[PDB]
């Protein structure tokens, strides 16, 4: 990146990009500078990319970004949780607060979900791991309220419960998951306000549990969830995050109507991490088991008829959420897409979930077919008929966001590139990785191609 940006105008973005690209001496120093001068909002974003230059690059590099988060390391404890995180995670082959205390309740907190995670690997059938699940979380209480967060909430917090009976497992697995549900009262700051005292005493689980909760009748508080998944690597599927949130930004910023919902992602390890769950969705294998039904069938069951609102809106909400998943799918060249990756919310978008396998990475054996999004002869009912009045509009609107795309390609391939550096992940695989990334935006192509290339994605989908 040539010094020579000496015209204009930065963006948090170029910034991370002139970081990671020049091979001058003066400009890595001066970039890590010119961090300070952004909203901590807008480069936390990158933080995985800031250590992941740190930890497998140069003394200028990672000097250059050194200071920067030391000041916020200082400012704030969450912030100091995240780099000790990725720290561990990203180097493989490479008031008691600032005080050495500091994350000590924490890292508890979070190895015991962790531990309870592990112990479930004896007990074979999945209501089994479930019974003891809650039988070892319940002990966990015995500890809260105490200095912890979910670094999931986007809002400061303590954790003052946990409604064990309502655990959950979701498979019968060795390394199997685990959803639950968390209460936590709200702060304003919470480096400053210190932690809150006991009393022993759909969605709407929440009203039911803070009912049932003795710190239910306060006005904080909130419930959340998460699934700990002890054994999952979830670095790739972390992403998969960068790019879909980028990408959702990309398509509010041109006015595109398409539909995708990233959901939070935390690398607590190289094997451990912890998601933030889509609710209220369902799986559509689900769906097609429960209802036993189409799922234009289902539609017309479960929101109006084919002239109520109810429909007409469930519909257009699966038209361009799928349409927006069609186009996330096809840039990171996402695969192992089945019925039990793809939900239905309540409102009827559709949603991906389980990135696992991505841009350079394969599922295994499955020596005949590619896992991949496919568009299913019983979605075109959905929308329409191959001719239909809103197929036209699935199409156009693919159309309208791989161009916002290509006008954006900088900042998506921003993001996986650096974080090649050093991985051992699957989804890199040389210099082919990112070659095809951009040929996979088409630069040099005409409107008139791409709506051509669209056509052939399409009628290339249904096989």
Known sequence: LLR?????????????????????PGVQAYIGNRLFCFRNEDVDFYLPQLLNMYIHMDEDVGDAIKPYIVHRCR????????????????????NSFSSPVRLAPEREFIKSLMAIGKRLATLPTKEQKTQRLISELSLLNHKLPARVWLPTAGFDHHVVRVPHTQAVVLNSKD??????????????????????????????????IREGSPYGHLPNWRLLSVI????????????????LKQLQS????????????????????????????????????QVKKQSQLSLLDYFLQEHGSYTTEAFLSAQRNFVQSC?????????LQVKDRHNGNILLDAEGHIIHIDFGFILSSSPRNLGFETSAFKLTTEFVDVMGGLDGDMFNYYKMLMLQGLIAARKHM???????????QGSQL????????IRNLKERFHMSMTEEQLQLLVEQMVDGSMR
Request: charged letters at 20%; hydrophobic letters at 45%; a negative charge.
């Open 323 to 331: 349409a927006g998943y069609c186009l996330v799918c096809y840039l």
């Open 228 to 243: 700990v998944k002890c054994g999952d690597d979830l670095r790739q599927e972390l992403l998969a995050f960068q790019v």
């Open 175 to 208: 390394k199997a998951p685990y959803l639950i549900y968390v209460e936590v009262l709200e702060c304003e700051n919470f480096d400053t306000t210190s932690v809150p005292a006991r009393i022993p005493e759909w969605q709407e689980k929440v009203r039911r």
């Open 75 to 94: 400012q704030s404890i969450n912030f100091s949780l995240q780099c000790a995180l990725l720290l561990g995670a990203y180097s493989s082959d490479m």
């Open 426 to 433: 699957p989804c890199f695989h040389g210099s082919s990785t």
């Open 250 to 285: 990309i398509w509010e910023q041109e006015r595109v109507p398409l539909w995708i919902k990233p959901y939070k992602i935390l690398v607590i390890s190289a094997d451990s991490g912890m998601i933030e769950p889509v609710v209220n969705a369902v799986s559509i294998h």
């Open 410 to 420: 900088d900042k998506v391939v921003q993001i996986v590139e650096i974080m090649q």
């Open 4 to 24: 020579l940006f000496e015209s204009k105008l930065f963006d948090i973005s170029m910034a991370i990009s002139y970081l990671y690209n020049s091979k001058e």
